[PDB]
Amino acid sequence: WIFHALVFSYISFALISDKRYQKKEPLISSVHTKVKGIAEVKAEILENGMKKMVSGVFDTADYTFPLQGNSFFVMTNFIKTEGQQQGLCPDFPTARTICSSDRGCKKGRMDPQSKGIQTGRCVVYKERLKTCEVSAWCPIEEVKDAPRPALLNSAENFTVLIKNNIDFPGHNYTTRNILPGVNITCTFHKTQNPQCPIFRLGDIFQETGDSFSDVAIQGGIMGIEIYWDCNLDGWFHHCRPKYSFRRLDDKTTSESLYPGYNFRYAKYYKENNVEKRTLIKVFGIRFDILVFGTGGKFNVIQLAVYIGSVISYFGLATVFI
Amino acid sequence: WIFHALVFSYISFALISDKRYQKKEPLISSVHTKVKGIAEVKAEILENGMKKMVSGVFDTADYTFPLQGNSFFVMTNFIKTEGQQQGLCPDFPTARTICSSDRGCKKGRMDPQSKGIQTGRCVVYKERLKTCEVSAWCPIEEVKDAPRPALLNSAENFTVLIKNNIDFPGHNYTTRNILPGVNITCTFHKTQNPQCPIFRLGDIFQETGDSFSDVAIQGGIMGIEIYWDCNLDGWFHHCRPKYSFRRLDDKTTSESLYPGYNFRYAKYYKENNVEKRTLIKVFGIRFDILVFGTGGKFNVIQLAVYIGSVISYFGLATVFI
Amino acid sequence: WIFHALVFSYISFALISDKRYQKKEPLISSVHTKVKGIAEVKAEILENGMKKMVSGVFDTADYTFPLQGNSFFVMTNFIKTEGQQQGLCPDFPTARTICSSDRGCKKGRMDPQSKGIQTGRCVVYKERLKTCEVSAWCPIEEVKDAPRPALLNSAENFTVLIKNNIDFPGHNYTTRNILPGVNITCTFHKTQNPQCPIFRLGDIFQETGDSFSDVAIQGGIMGIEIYWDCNLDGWFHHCRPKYSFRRLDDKTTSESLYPGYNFRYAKYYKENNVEKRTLIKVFGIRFDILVFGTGGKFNVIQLAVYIGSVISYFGLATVFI
Numbered sequence: 001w002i003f004h005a006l007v008f009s010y011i012s013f014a015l016i017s018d019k020r021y022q023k024k025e026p027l028i029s030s031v032h033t034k035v036k037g038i039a040e041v042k043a044e045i046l047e048n049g050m051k052k053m054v055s056g057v058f059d060t061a062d063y064t065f066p067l068q069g070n071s072f073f074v075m076t077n078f079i080k081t082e083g084q085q086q087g088l089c090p091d092f093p094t095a096r097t098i099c100s101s102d103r104g105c106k107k108g109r110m111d112p113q114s115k116g117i118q119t120g121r122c123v124v125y126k127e128r129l130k131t132c133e134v135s136a137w138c139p140i141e142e143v144k145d146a147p148r149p150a151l152l153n154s155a156e157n158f159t160v161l162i163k164n165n166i167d168f169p170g171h172n173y174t175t176r177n178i179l180p181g182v183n184i185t186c187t188f189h190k191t192q193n194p195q196c197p198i199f200r201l202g203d204i205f206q207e208t209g210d211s212f213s214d215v216a217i218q219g220g221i222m223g224i225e226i227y228w229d230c231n232l233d234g235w236f237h238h239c240r241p242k243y244s245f246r247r248l249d250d251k252t253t254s255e256s257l258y259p260g261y262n263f264r265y266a267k268y269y270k271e272n273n274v275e276k277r278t279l280i281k282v283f284g285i286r287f288d289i290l291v292f293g294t295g296g297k298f299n300v301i302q303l304a305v306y307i308g309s310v311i312s313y314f315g316l317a318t319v320f321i
Numbered sequence: 322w323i324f325h326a327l328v329f330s331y332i333s334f335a336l337i338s339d340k341r342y343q344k345k346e347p348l349i350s351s352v353h354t355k356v357k358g359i360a361e362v363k364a365e366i367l368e369n370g371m372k373k374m375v376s377g378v379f380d381t382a383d384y385t386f387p388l389q390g391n392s393f394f395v396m397t398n399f400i401k402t403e404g405q406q407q408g409l410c411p412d413f414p415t416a417r418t419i420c421s422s423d424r425g426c427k428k429g430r431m432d433p434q435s436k437g438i439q440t441g442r443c444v445v446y447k448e449r450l451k452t453c454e455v456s457a458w459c460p461i462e463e464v465k466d467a468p469r470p471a472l473l474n475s476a477e478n479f480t481v482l483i484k485n486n487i488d489f490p491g492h493n494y495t496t497r498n499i500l501p502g503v504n505i506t507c508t509f510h511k512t513q514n515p516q517c518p519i520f521r522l523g524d525i526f527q528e529t530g531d532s533f534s535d536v537a538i539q540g541g542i543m544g545i546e547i548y549w550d551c552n553l554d555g556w557f558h559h560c561r562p563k564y565s566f567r568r569l570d571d572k573t574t575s576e577s578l579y580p581g582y583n584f585r586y587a588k589y590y591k592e593n594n595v596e597k598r599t600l601i602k603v604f605g606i607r608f609d610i611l612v613f614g615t616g617g618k619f620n621v622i623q624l625a626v627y628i629g630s631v632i633s634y635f636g637l638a639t640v641f642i
Numbered sequence: 643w644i645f646h647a648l649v650f651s652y653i654s655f656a657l658i659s660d661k662r663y664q665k666k667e668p669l670i671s672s673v674h675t676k677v678k679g680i681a682e683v684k685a686e687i688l689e690n691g692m693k694k695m696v697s698g699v700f701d702t703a704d705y706t707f708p709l710q711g712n713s714f715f716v717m718t719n720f721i722k723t724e725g726q727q728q729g730l731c732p733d734f735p736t737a738r739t740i741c742s743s744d745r746g747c748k749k750g751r752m753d754p755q756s757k758g759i760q761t762g763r764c765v766v767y768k769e770r771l772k773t774c775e776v777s778a779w780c781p782i783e784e785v786k787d788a789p790r791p792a793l794l795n796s797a798e799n800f801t802v803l804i805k806n807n808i809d810f811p812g813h814n815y816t817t818r819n820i821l822p823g824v825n826i827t828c829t830f831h832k833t834q835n836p837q838c839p840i841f842r843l844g845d846i847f848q849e850t851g852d853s854f855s856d857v858a859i860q861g862g863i864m865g866i867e868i869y870w871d872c873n874l875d876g877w878f879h880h881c882r883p884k885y886s887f888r889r890l891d892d893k894t895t896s897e898s899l900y901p902g903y904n905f906r907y908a909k910y911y912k913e914n915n916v917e918k919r920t921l922i923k924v925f926g927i928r929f930d931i932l933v934f935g936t937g938g939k940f941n942v943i944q945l946a947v948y949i950g951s952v953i954s955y956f957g958l959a960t961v962f963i
């Protein structure tokens with residue numbers, strides 16, 4: 001009957017369109033990115049109630065490190081606390097660190113917010129305000145918001161160049177993201193330059209619809225996705241990437257969940273024969289490059305299995321009517 | 322017959338239970354962990370036969386660096402050799418470095434255990450013991466065991482917070498390890514808090530049944546596994562992680578296989594207009610976060626293929642009896 | 643007929659050979675590599691038209707850092723620019739930086755090749771040659787080729803030891819690259835020692851057919867592949883790795899595509915109460931360890947599905963003749 005040529009046709013259609021005849025191999029990627037662009041910074045930051053002038057120019061080595069583990073990071077803001085040395089000092093005044101008397105402090109106590117071990121003594125921090133005394137690197141860094149203008153706010157104007165090599169082992173097929181002979185001088189655009197590997201970070205943040213400056217103040221984790229729908233047949237060959245952009249960070253905005261991206265970097269030195277340390281809280285956006293792909297190539301055994309599940313249907317449609 | 326409704330029922334059962342109707346997509350994860358906790362260290366370490374007092378407090382910046390490549394490391398013990406400068410010095414006495422005369426040493430020789438190039442001269446190291454003379458950073462670090470108490474033995478009391486975002490692209494489904502609104506203040510427990518992302522390192526080492534201190538002396542590689550069995554149907558929806566713990570390091574305990582986790586960190590400075598270097602052998606536990614998942618969502622073509630292989634069986638069971 | 647026992651036999655053959663009866667699970671790997679070997683460097687490098695003598699010995703800490711993200715790097719060449727401080731200086735003379743008059747320079751201009759922000763002034767750089775004045779770390783590094791002999795040319799003689807642990811979760815099977823009791827003292831050979839994990843970098847570069855020195859001058863990205871075809875049956879059990887070597891870098895050799903592997907490392911210090919910086923351009927080869935595997939174990943449901951697509955064929959071959 002007609003419903004049978006229609007069943008055959010629906011099966012074969014699902015084969016040809018859903019690519020059931022092809023064998024699919026997982027993709028293998030290695031990433032090499034180079035960042036370009038510099039930022040000039042003139043800003044006034046308050047340290048310990050005293051105005052200080054942070055000025056200067058930041059180049060590649062000043063704000064970034066080469067990617068490792070398919071992810072690179074760019075510092076967009078920072079807080080610097082200098083001159084720390086091992087000693088005893090009162091903790092920074094917080095809801096949990098203020099003491100009325102020595103009875104309020106407990107010797108040897110450790111608190112998740114604090115950075116030192118208490119000595120069980122109540123001492124003044126400033127004027128008549130009293131905090132608990134601790135043993136740590138002194139003085140203790142301020143509990144302060146990241147500067148209201150992100151010191152490296154120019155970070156949206158930076159340029160990231162992404163090189164991606166992909167290899168399918170089952171089919172012995174190697175290709176790279178940048179095809180030979182292309183005009184390298186371009187800026188990636190969703191339509192105008194969908195294969196251009198030159199990305200602007202601000203463009204990236206507009207794609208996902210999040211403001212760059214806001215994330216740049218306190219940090220975040222952004223992700224770049226590279227898709228490969230690759231066909232290794234010849235009768236319909238195609239194998240290029242599709243760039244998409246997703247914001248990965250949670251954006252909880254709760255003190256308990258350590259929001260944004262930041263980490264503590266330590267630089268050690270010696271003055272007057274004393275072990276000393278400058279502590280730098282680093283704020284920035286970490287970019288994670290995720291590359292995924294599927295390689296299809298005509299396989300005879302798969303066609304055999306597919307018509308295998310197809311023929312039983314083909315006659316069952318006869319038993320049905 | 323009855324065996325036929327039983328064959329139909331066994332096939333359909335394997336479908337409903339082994340989830341044959343669903344399409345399975347691979348999981349995509351990015352990891353962001355924050356470490357919390359500090360350690361106070363008072364210990365006596367022998368350098369060159371002289372007792373020295375290692376004291377002080379170690380905070381986040383002092384023992385760890387932000388994770389990259391889905392793995393973070395925590396230093397648990399260390400050996401420090403200070404004041405090195407380019408020069409000529411006798412190698413540290415070993416089974417392979419002791420020399421009776423200049424004939425025993427070979428100029429320009431390189432040995433896997435040694436850290437310098439020999440000059441072919443036999444010279445005294447201490448008293449009448451003689452070793453081969455080498456060209457390297459001097460003095461050469463001691464061949465010494467890591468301190469019998471791990472200097473940062475408090476490391477089991479530390480807290481690691483793990484944030485995991487997972488995304489299935491074929492189904493356009495994004496979720497994160499921490500569901501919104503949960504009580505963040507908890508410590509992970511195999512039963513009491515199986516979804517709590519706050520982990521204690523000592524608890525981790527008890528799960529895999531290995532003592533934390535022993536690994537902390539000379540280092541090791543520990544691994545955290547995060548499973549996602551995710552169902553994107555609705556008729557039986559569920560998609561949460563299962564935390565499991567495996568000890569990854571080999572634990573060979575053979576000098577040839579460089580057991581444990583350690584690496585050589587170099588800090589450079591200048592004194593009296595001389596290039597100089599302090600070398601620090603770092604011992605610690607590296608934690609590797611491995612995240613895997615499968616996303617199932619009802620697929621009509623798969624049901625078609627499955628009943629496709631099912632019907633042939635269904636009649637063959639008739640031909641059999 | 644005979645063509646039918648032949649169809650049955652072809653189907654069952656494809657089953658037994660293409661391993662259709664087995665269930666395949668993806669492999670999970672963590673990598674731990676230790677690098678061994680040192681290099682002695684005596685070379686004459688020209689800085690600012692003045693000959694300078696770079697001598698000294700480089701050990702593990704001097705040229706490498708422990709791997710993170712399944713990739714380790716080894717510096718093979720370097721360029722060092724010392725004494726930089728924040729200030730105003732003329733840019734290094736280039737095709738884009740030479741100025742005839744102040745009209746040629748534009749204040750506040752930024753150029754991808756330059757490392758500073760222009761001040762719109764034309765000033766002399768050397769003799770009567772004039773470049774545009776910029777605001778940056780001064781002096782600006784030379785536009786110079788990497789030293790004609792790679793300073794760390796000895797890098798091909800280095801030894802990398804690779805430890806790989808693989809685990810299949812669906813089958814609960816854990817194994818490691820190094821089986822217990824093997825003779826560790828060996829050098830990997832394609833035939834003589836195909837399971838030896840001790841690799842020589844020069845051997846690696848000969849496998850892929852690229853000269854080590856050439857890549858060592860300006861850097862590159864090399865990749866080590868570890869295959870696991872693992873059978874968890876018993877009736878034909880086998881599960882060991884196959885080491886293969888592929889050169890991953892593009893080798894474009896175009897200034898626009900930033901060829902080779904290099905990055906900018908910054909070291910900060912203070913002299914006469916002035917913020918200062920030494921900038922080091924690092925050239926080296928990054929090795930990316932890619933591990934892939936498939937674990938097969940006899941599965942009854944898969945045999946059921948396979949004969950499911952098989953029987954329909956088995957009778958259709960009867961309808962055909």
Ligand SMILES: O=C(C[C@]12C[C@H]3C[C@H](C[C@H](C3)C1)C2)Nc1cccc2nc(NCCNCCO)ccc12
Pocket residue numbers: 054055056057058061062063064065075078080265280282728908917
């Ligand atoms: O610490 C770094 C290097 C990196 C940055 C990220 C994070 C971490 C790994 C990697 C990526 C390298 C450290 N950069 C800096 C941080 C904070 C302040 C800095 N100030 C500078 N000079 C300005 C002086 N003004 C006087 C002028 O009159 C220069 C560099 C700075």
Ligand SMILES: O=C(C[C@]12C[C@H]3C[C@H](C[C@H](C3)C1)C2)Nc1cccc2nc(NCCNCCO)ccc12
Pocket residue numbers: 086266275375376377378379382383384385386396399401586601603
């Ligand atoms: O080197 C580091 C930083 C890290 C540690 C790991 C490994 C590596 C990358 C990243 C993670 C940062 C280096 N920390 C240290 C190592 C060894 C000794 C140290 N001693 C310290 N002061 C004690 C002085 N006592 C005098 C008191 O009277 C402070 C820090 C120390």
Ligand SMILES: O=C(C[C@]12C[C@H]3C[C@H](C[C@H](C3)C1)C2)Nc1cccc2nc(NCCNCCO)ccc12
Pocket residue numbers: 407587596696697698699700703704705706707717720722907922924
């Ligand atoms: O900077 C590093 C450390 C690493 C190297 C790579 C890249 C980066 C991360 C990690 C891997 C550590 C930095 N090493 C060096 C670089 C350049 C020059 C050096 N010169 C040295 N002394 C020679 C003096 N001659 C006077 C004798 O009369 C010693 C070390 C040097």
Ligand SMILES: *[C@@H]1O[C@H](CO)[C@@H](O[C@@H]2O[C@H](CO)[C@@H](O)[C@H](O)[C@H]2NC(C)=O)[C@H](O)[C@H]1NC(C)=O
Pocket residue numbers: 153154155156157
């Ligand atoms: C990134 O660069 C753009 C242009 O290069 C900056 O936009 C310019 O802003 C200045 C004032 O600061 C204006 O005089 C220009 O006319 C603007 N140009 C354009 C094309 O709009 C932008 O400010 C830079 N980003 C940051 C954070 O400074």
Ligand SMILES: *[C@@H]1O[C@H](CO)[C@@H](O[C@@H]2O[C@H](CO)[C@@H](O)[C@H](O)[C@H]2NC(C)=O)[C@H](O)[C@H]1NC(C)=O
Pocket residue numbers: 474475476477478
């Ligand atoms: C980790 O912390 C626990 C408790 O916070 C420590 O156990 C305590 O040990 C001290 C003596 O050192 C005792 O006075 C306490 O009563 C103990 N408390 C508990 C709850 O057992 C433990 O010693 C710490 N780990 C390390 C390595 O110091």
Ligand SMILES: *[C@@H]1O[C@H](CO)[C@@H](O[C@@H]2O[C@H](CO)[C@@H](O)[C@H](O)[C@H]2NC(C)=O)[C@H](O)[C@H]1NC(C)=O
Pocket residue numbers: 795796797798799
């Ligand atoms: C790597 O090591 C080999 C041997 O260890 C070096 O080859 C030697 O070169 C010297 C001269 O430089 C000769 O005297 C030896 O006879 C050579 N030995 C062999 C076995 O050929 C090689 O030069 C080293 N690589 C580099 C870059 O120096």
Ligand SMILES: *[C@@H]1O[C@H](CO)[C@@H](O)[C@H](O)[C@H]1NC(C)=O
Pocket residue numbers: 172
């Ligand atoms: C992959 O294909 C190329 C085609 O030129 C061939 O030269 C190469 O040997 C193949 N590799 C393998 C492992 O078969």
Ligand SMILES: *[C@@H]1O[C@H](CO)[C@@H](O)[C@H](O)[C@H]1NC(C)=O
Pocket residue numbers: 183184185
């Ligand atoms: C690349 O395209 C731009 C226009 O977008 C053009 O100005 C430039 O000359 C092109 N490059 C080459 C090498 O043709």
Ligand SMILES: *[C@@H]1O[C@H](CO)[C@@H](O)[C@H](O)[C@H]1NC(C)=O
Pocket residue numbers: 493
């Ligand atoms: C994914 O689903 C959400 C549901 O609200 C939708 O808004 C979004 O556009 C979808 N994404 C794609 C790529 O279809």
Ligand SMILES: *[C@@H]1O[C@H](CO)[C@@H](O)[C@H](O)[C@H]1NC(C)=O
Pocket residue numbers: 504505506
């Ligand atoms: C979380 O649970 C603890 C008890 O385990 C409780 O004391 C605490 O108040 C809870 N947090 C919130 C916000 O309810």
Ligand SMILES: *[C@@H]1O[C@H](CO)[C@@H](O)[C@H](O)[C@H]1NC(C)=O
Pocket residue numbers: 814
């Ligand atoms: C894996 O197999 C071993 C075999 O001895 C067994 O001890 C272990 O409990 C198994 N693990 C799981 C999760 O079943």
Ligand SMILES: *[C@@H]1O[C@H](CO)[C@@H](O)[C@H](O)[C@H]1NC(C)=O
Pocket residue numbers: 825826827
């Ligand atoms: C390993 O093999 C070498 C020969 O290639 C031999 O000299 C050495 O003794 C062997 N090691 C052991 C422990 O037998």
